[PDB]
Each structure stands twice: as structure tokens, then as C-alpha cells.
Copies of this chain bind each other. A is one copy, B any other.
Amino acid sequence: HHMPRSVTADASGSFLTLTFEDGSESRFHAIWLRDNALDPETRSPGNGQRLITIGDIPADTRISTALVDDGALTVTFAPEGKTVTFPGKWLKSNAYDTDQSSEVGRTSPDVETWDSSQPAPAFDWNEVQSDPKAKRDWLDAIARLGFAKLVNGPVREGALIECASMFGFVRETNYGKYFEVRTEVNPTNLAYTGLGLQAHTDNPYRDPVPSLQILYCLENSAEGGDSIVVDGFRAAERLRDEDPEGFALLAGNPARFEYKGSDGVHLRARRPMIELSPDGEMIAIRFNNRSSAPFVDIPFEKMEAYYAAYRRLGEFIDDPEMGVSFKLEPGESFIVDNTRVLHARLGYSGSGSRWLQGCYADKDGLFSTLNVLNAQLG
């Protein structure tokens, strides 16, 4: 329950214990409550910005008195003398006196991992623009699963930029706001089109890594070459469940990535292939064979085992039962969460031409747009 019943303050005033109507208890420290006061002199009413620093809060701050009344908690602090009230709902929702999961390599509860049994989420270009429920569902699919298709879009150059603008902002690079991906498939070219088709995340040599990628089809007359996506979190999960020490090595040591092109682009980054939050949640995958650079940061005594784990992760990524495959017809596109979901394509099986456009955008904007839609539809 989120309905407060009563409160006791410790003799020290250093914390209080809130009891709810279902019998549950939750303890809150004086300093935390003071810092999180929601009144107009702590949080600006117009923009929600906090108006005080930690330095502004007296170091000896304590709870003087407190009371539960009519679904809310009244708290008065000393030595300031400041009285504030907290809604019951807010206290329960923002509780920290709970059992924090510490499992190393766990995923956020908001994501669902997948393999080849997962259908490609698909949404309509026009519906996502006119119906906020469709837009919400489209962005929610990218949030939960890390990818989604958009179909029935226009066969127009730069349309992918319009897609990005539906939720956020394009990460412009040296290659432009977007780049052309043109392919001529014929008997002569067929050989080299088979090279470098391992699933990968783009640009692990950029820090910060571009967090979303959009690929948009304008023309396709070549047979085969289905797009493939692989869940980096599923691959990492499989490694962890099988080989926790190997998982720990890939998460516990940075790799090196580098792109040094002939057209004056030289990009480098130092980041692990599996990135965890400091409390163990899996937050990002970086995997790209073509731009992996010399691993200079891994101690000698761990290098062999690191390489073994790296190989094993690659085997999960190369596993065909991990890939979700789909065709892209003119006007169709897909987005990947480039911090999680890898992409590639299968081999071409017939001659022809293909024209895709690619760009990057950032997840923060997508989540904001999703948050706003959820509030509007709630």
C-alpha cells in the first residue's frame, strides 16, 4: 500500500520509520528527506529545479518532529525549522529502504531479451505520426526490445531524418547528418559482398557511442541480403549463465576500438565489450570485429582467459538461432538501440542494386518522447 498510517522518529532525529496501511515499513534519513523536499523553496514550481545545494543544508540536519495525517507525512527539520509535507504515494514510490538487487550482469526490468523466436516489431509510418498511441507503442518496442521496423514510409531521400525527428535528434558526424549505403550486386562484386558480415554495433570507436541507428531502404532489386539483428544482451546473458568468470573478464577489462580512414577520420575509444553499471546492471554492448584495436589494458595474467571469453561471445553472436531476419522494401526502415542490439545482413543470392540511407540518433530523446507520451496517454 501507498497509504501512510503512522510514523516514528528515531531519538537521534537522524531517520524516521513510516508505516503504511498494509503493515509495511520504510525508513527515511533526515538528510535524504531534506534534500528531497518538494516545497517551492526547495524545488522551483515552474521548472522543478532544486534551489539549494548540499552545502546549503546544515550538516547537523535532523528530524525535529513528524506526523502522518490524511495520506501525507509532515516533517519539520532542525536546525532550519523548516516544515514540509510529502504525499504518501511519493514516499512509497521513492523508497530506498528496500532489497536492492545486486546480481552481476542482470538486465533492467524494463528490457526483454530475445532470440530468433522474436518477431520484428512493425509499425506504420503514417499511424505513428497521427496516433500518439501508435507512436508510444513504436518507441516502447525500441525501449523494451532494442529494435523496431517502420513500414509504408515515403520513398524519398532524407526520409530517415524525418523519422529521427519524430522522437529526437540526429547525431551528426563527419559523414554528414546521414550517409548513403549503395550496393551493386553482380557476379564480379558478389565475392567481396560476402566479407565482414558478422553482426556488430556501429562505431564502438566513438565515445560517446551513437546510441540509436536508423537504416532506411530507398531501392532494392537484389535478391537475399535480409537484414539481421542480434540481441547483445541475450548473447551476454548466455555467456554469463554458462561461464560467469568469462563474462566477468569481458565486463571487467576495457577493450580498444579504432577507426583510421584514408579520408582524415581517426576515432578511438577505450571501453569494455560488456558495460555494467557500478551496481552490476548490464547497460551496454560494444562488439565490432573490424574496428577492434590492440588490447593494451588487460593484464598479462588475464589475457588468455579474456580471449577465450571473447571467442565464446563471438560464437553466441554468430549463432543463427540468435538472429531475427527481415526484408526491407522501399520506404521501410528499422531502428536499433546501438548500445545493445547488433546488426548485419545475410548474403546476397541474386544480382541487382540496393540503396539504403543510414543515420544515428540518441536514446535520451527517445525516452523523453516516450515519457511525455505516457503521461499524455496515462
Interface residues of A, count at CB 8 A: 96
Q: How many copies does the complex hold?
A: 2
Could you say which of B47, B261, B277 contacts A188, with CB atoms under 8 Å apart? Answer: B47
Residues of B within 8 A of A112 (CB): none
Residues of B within 8 A of A307 (CB): 29, 31-32, 35, 54
Check B364 against A55 for contact (C-beta < 8 Å): no
Could you say which of B31, B35, B270 contacts A277, with CB atoms under 8 Å apart? Answer: B270
A292-B56 Cα distance, complex, nearest whole Å: 14
Check A368 against B278 for contact (C-beta < 8 Å): no
Check A94 against B296 for contact (C-beta < 8 Å): yes
Could you say which of B14, B51, B262, B371 contacts A47, with CB atoms under 8 Å apart? Answer: B262
**A158 contacts partner chain B, Cβ-Cβ < 8 Å:** no
A298-B102 Cα distance, complex, nearest whole Å: 11
A110-B172 Cα distance, complex, nearest whole Å: 27
**A39 contacts partner chain B, Cβ-Cβ < 8 Å:** no
Quote the shortest CB–CB distance from A176 to chain B (angstroms).
10
Residues of B within 8 A of A240 (CB): none
* Given A47-B262, A55-B311, A268-B371: A171 in contact with B171 (beta carbons within 8 A): yes
22 contacts across the A-B interface (CB closer than 8 A): A14-B304, A31-B303, A32-B294, A32-B303, A32-B307, A46-B187, A47-B187, A48-B258, A48-B260, A50-B289, A55-B315, A55-B318, A94-B294, A95-B296, A96-B296, A96-B299, A173-B365, A208-B208, A254-B277, A266-B368, A268-B371, A271-B277
Residues of B within 8 A of A272 (CB): 277-278
A96-B311 Cα distance, complex, nearest whole Å: 19
For chain A residues 39-60, which have a beta carbon within 8 Å of chain B?
A: 44, 46-55, 57, 59
**A310 contacts partner chain B, Cβ-Cβ < 8 Å:** yes
**A97 contacts partner chain B, Cβ-Cβ < 8 Å:** yes
**A136 contacts partner chain B, Cβ-Cβ < 8 Å:** no
A57-B292 Cα distance, complex, nearest whole Å: 14
**A209 contacts partner chain B, Cβ-Cβ < 8 Å:** yes
Could you say which of B46, B268, B304, B362 contacts A29, with CB atoms under 8 Å apart? Answer: B304
Quote the shortest CB–CB distance from A338 to chain B (angstroms).
11
Chain B: CB-nearest residue to A209: B208
Could you say which of B95, B208, B270 contacts A364, with CB atoms under 8 Å apart? Answer: B208
A171-B259 Cα distance, complex, nearest whole Å: 21
Could you say which of B195, B289, B298 contacts A54, with CB atoms under 8 Å apart? Answer: B289
Check A372 against B265 for contact (C-beta < 8 Å): yes
**A71 contacts partner chain B, Cβ-Cβ < 8 Å:** no
Quote the shortest CB–CB distance from A125 to chain B (angstroms).
22
* A 236-263 binary contact with B (CB < 8 Å = 1; else 0): 0000000000000001111000111111
For chain A residues 280-328, which have a beta carbon within 8 Å of chain B?
A: 289-292, 294-300, 303-304, 307, 310-311, 314-315, 318
